[PDB]
Design an enzyme around this catalytic site. Structure first.
Site, mmCIF file in Angstrom:
data_model
loop_
_atom_site.group_PDB
_atom_site.id
_atom_site.type_symbol
_atom_site.label_atom_id
_atom_site.label_comp_id
_atom_site.label_asym_id
_atom_site.label_seq_id
_atom_site.Cartn_x
_atom_site.Cartn_y
_atom_site.Cartn_z
ATOM 1 N N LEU A 6 -5.469 2.914 7.670
ATOM 2 C CA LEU A 6 -6.264 3.995 6.914
ATOM 3 C C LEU A 6 -6.410 3.585 5.590
ATOM 4 O O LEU A 6 -5.367 3.067 4.964
ATOM 5 C CB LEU A 6 -5.536 5.362 7.458
ATOM 6 C CG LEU A 6 -5.490 5.388 8.964
ATOM 7 C CD1 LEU A 6 -4.500 6.514 9.541
ATOM 8 C CD2 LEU A 6 -6.738 5.962 9.257
ATOM 9 N N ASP B 54 6.853 17.543 7.885
ATOM 10 C CA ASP B 54 6.939 17.116 6.597
ATOM 11 C C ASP B 54 5.364 16.782 6.397
ATOM 12 O O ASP B 54 4.815 15.595 5.708
ATOM 13 C CB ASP B 54 7.504 15.620 6.147
ATOM 14 C CG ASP B 54 7.749 15.299 4.892
ATOM 15 O OD1 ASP B 54 7.954 16.381 3.878
ATOM 16 O OD2 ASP B 54 7.919 14.465 4.157
ATOM 17 N N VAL C 20 5.215 -0.490 2.730
ATOM 18 C CA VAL C 20 4.155 -0.664 3.727
ATOM 19 C C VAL C 20 3.177 -1.665 3.109
ATOM 20 O O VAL C 20 2.836 -1.587 2.065
ATOM 21 C CB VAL C 20 3.638 0.460 4.096
ATOM 22 C CG1 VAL C 20 2.399 0.495 5.099
ATOM 23 C CG2 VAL C 20 4.748 1.322 5.003
ATOM 24 N N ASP D 15 3.547 9.276 9.197
ATOM 25 C CA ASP D 15 4.980 9.422 8.751
ATOM 26 C C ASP D 15 5.643 10.218 9.667
ATOM 27 O O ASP D 15 5.852 11.475 9.292
ATOM 28 C CB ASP D 15 5.029 9.722 7.070
ATOM 29 C CG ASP D 15 6.452 9.169 6.575
ATOM 30 O OD1 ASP D 15 7.322 8.980 7.680
ATOM 31 O OD2 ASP D 15 6.741 9.486 5.409
ATOM 32 N N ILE E 236 0.866 -1.236 -0.149
ATOM 33 C CA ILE E 236 0.043 0.011 0.038
ATOM 34 C C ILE E 236 0.619 1.309 0.124
ATOM 35 O O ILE E 236 0.327 2.400 -0.223
ATOM 36 C CB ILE E 236 -1.069 -0.095 1.193
ATOM 37 C CG1 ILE E 236 -0.370 -0.145 2.581
ATOM 38 C CG2 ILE E 236 -2.147 -0.891 0.974
ATOM 39 C CD1 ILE E 236 -1.315 0.214 3.640
ATOM 40 N N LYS F 289 4.738 -1.449 8.539
ATOM 41 C CA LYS F 289 5.748 -0.755 7.782
ATOM 42 C C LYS F 289 7.091 -1.260 8.114
ATOM 43 O O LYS F 289 7.559 -1.498 9.308
ATOM 44 C CB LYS F 289 5.993 1.066 8.545
ATOM 45 C CG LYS F 289 6.775 1.811 8.060
ATOM 46 C CD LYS F 289 6.444 3.218 8.232
ATOM 47 C CE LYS F 289 7.558 4.101 7.686
ATOM 48 N NZ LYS F 289 7.171 5.515 8.149
HETATM 49 BR BR1 LIG Z 1 -2.628 3.125 5.187
HETATM 50 C C1 LIG Z 1 -0.657 3.644 5.597
HETATM 51 C C2 LIG Z 1 -0.358 3.724 6.763
HETATM 52 BR BR2 LIG Z 1 -1.616 3.463 8.056
HETATM 53 C C3 LIG Z 1 0.753 4.026 7.026
HETATM 54 BR BR3 LIG Z 1 1.241 4.111 8.922
HETATM 55 C C4 LIG Z 1 1.654 4.467 6.032
HETATM 56 N N1 LIG Z 1 3.239 4.881 6.072
HETATM 57 N N2 LIG Z 1 3.629 4.708 4.882
HETATM 58 N N3 LIG Z 1 2.376 4.529 3.862
HETATM 59 C C5 LIG Z 1 1.374 4.428 4.624
HETATM 60 C C6 LIG Z 1 0.069 4.115 4.493
HETATM 61 BR BR4 LIG Z 1 -0.382 3.739 2.705
#
Ligand SMILES: Brc1c(Br)c(Br)c2[nH]nnc2c1Br
Lengths: 297, 258
Positions: free
Chosen positions: A84, A128, A19, A146, A11, A34
């Site tokens: 999410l 960020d 991730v 993040d 994702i 992650k």
């Molecule tokens: Br959903 C999700 C979530 Br929860 C996180 Br924590 C992430 N960190 N990098 N990309 C991400 C995504 Br897509």
């Protein structure tokens, strides 16, 4: 334990791994994993991971992505996060048709400000804030995510890493090489995001630091000592900078009503001292009728 | 800045209780003593100077060591390995440019391998459960400095000097919280340099008075008076530098008149 998790699909991805969407086989809980690659030699646990984990462990808030667990499985780190559904950038793209309903923009800004005020009250700078790091779910929530680039600050702050923040969302005080930057940098970023949610395009899409500054100057006026005491003394201010007039602010984000415009202008104030805190912004008249509707898509 | 001053102070006052080491841990360490700890911290001061690390980094590393040693029995020949990993973790957390791991391996004069340091890094993170954002004496001091009128560079440097000295001696400083040590260090610094006392505005902010700080102040004042004679000297030497306004050459007061 890794055993209890069933990977579903990829994702996203960061510097130290991808991730995955996964699901807890026992509770049913859908999670994001992650991956952080560790390497036995080289440098050990990356500082970005050290910062992301330790700061996220303190930050329990409905508008901050929840770190559920940290798994060390034989020379990698898995960060177990609440799942999410998508990021704000993808949602704005998906809304390229018609815009985002104003109730939703207002709901998202209000929630972002709540999450940020919580960060700042807990001495954390995000550093960020961009749409790709803002995650939404199907219930209408939006959450800061993040925290790899975040840091715990002191009061008063000292000099920290320069040139922080993805360029488009980077504050003028960073761009101008100020010795000190603080919470106001995250507000500048949210100001750019507010604008972006309305127009669906980046407010200041520069390709270099000087280009970024000039785009800002042409939108808000070139700052002088009246608007921002000290500007001309800042390390990367140059007297040769073109002196652009400040635009009618109603032209920066034309769909914005009086209150939205008022709020945006306080988020995009040049002087970090005068720029609105996330805390103060929550009580702005723009939010008088805020609700938290489900995403329209 | 001003909008969050109170929230943050409140929050750190909560976290310092949560991040406190156990007052009595050394009694429960079979093979190490307060004196060996003193030696380790003194060396860490030197490492910090060698690599020009923030004082904050030093304070964090000591906090990580005392917490680790609150849970984990450690042999004398491994104490320095714990110390080195803690200072690596502190640096990655706090520094713009942390020294590379090879530089930390080097400073131990090759007593340990790179692999050992890296394994200890991970162990320390496990024992601490990654809880690295610990309040330090330093973090409270810089807030207290905002209550000077006017600001005095020698007061600030001297307070940091004194706060730093308290890192060396587990007995008795382990029993005081960072905010309390910072309180005593700030009053003592202010008194030494300007003759002024713990300001009213900081009673309002912290709820500490000269009375509540007295025990720590009594201890700190002794440490101050006896500092030239202490077996560990790296902090005095460090604070002779003009970076810190040579405050270690200032004379301590003979009495506090409290
Ligand atoms: Br959903 C999700 C979530 Br929860 C996180 Br924590 C992430 N960190 N990098 N990309 C991400 C995504 Br897509």
């Amino acid at each position: 334990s890794m055993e209890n998790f069933q990977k579903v699909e990829k994702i996203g991805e960061g510097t130290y791994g991808v991730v995955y969407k996964a699901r807890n086989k026992l509770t049913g809980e859908v999670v994001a994993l992650k991956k952080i690659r560790l390497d036995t030699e080289t440098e050990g646990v990356p500082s970005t991971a050290i910062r992301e984990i330790s700061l996220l462990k303190e930050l329990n808030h409905p508008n901050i992505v929840k770190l559920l667990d940290v798994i060390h499985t034989e020379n990698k780190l898995y960060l177990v996060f609440e799942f999410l559904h998508q990021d704000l950038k993808k949602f704005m793209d998906a809304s390229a048709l018609t815009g985002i309903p104003l109730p939703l923009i207002k709901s998202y800004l209000f929630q972002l400000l709540q999450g940020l005020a919580f960060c700042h009250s807990h001495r954390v700078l995000h550093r960020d804030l961009k749409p790709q790091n803002l995650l939404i779910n199907t219930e209408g929530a939006i959450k800061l995510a993040d925290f790899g680039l975040a840091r715990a600050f002191g009061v008063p702050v000292r000099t920290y890493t320069h040139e922080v923040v993805t360029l488009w969302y980077r504050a003028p005080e960073i761009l101008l090489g100020c010795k000190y930057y603080s919470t106001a940098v995250d507000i500048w970023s949210l100001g750019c995001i507010f604008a972006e949610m309305v127009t669906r395009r980046a407010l200041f899409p520069g390709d270099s630091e000087i280009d970024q500054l000039f785009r800002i100057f042409r939108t808000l006026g070139t700052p002088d000592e009246v608007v921002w005491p000290g500007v001309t003394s800042m390390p990367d201010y140059k007297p040769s900078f073109p002196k652009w007039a400040r635009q009618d602010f109603s032209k920066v984000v034309p769909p914005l009503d009086e209150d939205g415009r008022s709020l945006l202008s306080q988020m995009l104030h040049y002087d970090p001292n005068k720029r609105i805190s996330a805390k103060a912004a929550l009580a702005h008249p723009f939010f008088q009728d805020v609700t938290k509707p489900v995403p329209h898509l | 800045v001003p909008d969050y001053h109170e929230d943050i102070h409140t929050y750190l006052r909560e976290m310092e209780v949560k991040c406190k080491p156990k007052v009595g841990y050394m009694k429960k360490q079979p093979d190490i003593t307060n004196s060996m700890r003193a030696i380790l911290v003194d060396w860490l001061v030197e490492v910090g100077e060698e690599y020009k690390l923030q004082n904050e980094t030093l304070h964090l590393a000591v906090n990580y060591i005392d917490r680790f040693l609150s849970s984990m029995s450690v042999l004398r020949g491994k104490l320095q390995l714990v110390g080195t990993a803690a200072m690596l973790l502190a640096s990655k957390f706090e520094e713009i440019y942390p020294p590379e791991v090879a530089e930390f391996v080097y400073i131990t004069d090759d007593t340990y391998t790179k692999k050992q340091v890296l394994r200890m890094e991970h162990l320390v993170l496990k024992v601490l459960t990654f809880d690295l954002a610990a309040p330090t004496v330093n973090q409270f001091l810089t807030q207290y400095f905002l209550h000077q009128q006017p600001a005095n560079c020698k007061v600030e440097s001297l307070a940091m000097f004194l706060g730093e000295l308290s890192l060396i001696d587990a007995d008795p400083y382990l029993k005081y919280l960072p905010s309390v040590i910072a309180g005593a260090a700030f009053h003592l610094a202010l008194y030494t340099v300007t003759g002024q006392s713990w300001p009213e505005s900081l009673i309002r902010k912290t709820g500490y008075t000269l009375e509540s700080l007295k025990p720590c102040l009594m201890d700190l004042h002794q440490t101050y008076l006896k500092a030239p004679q202490h077996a560990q000297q790296s902090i005095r030497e460090k604070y002779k530098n003009s970076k810190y306004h040579g405050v270690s050459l200032l004379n301590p007061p003979e009495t506090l008149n409290l």
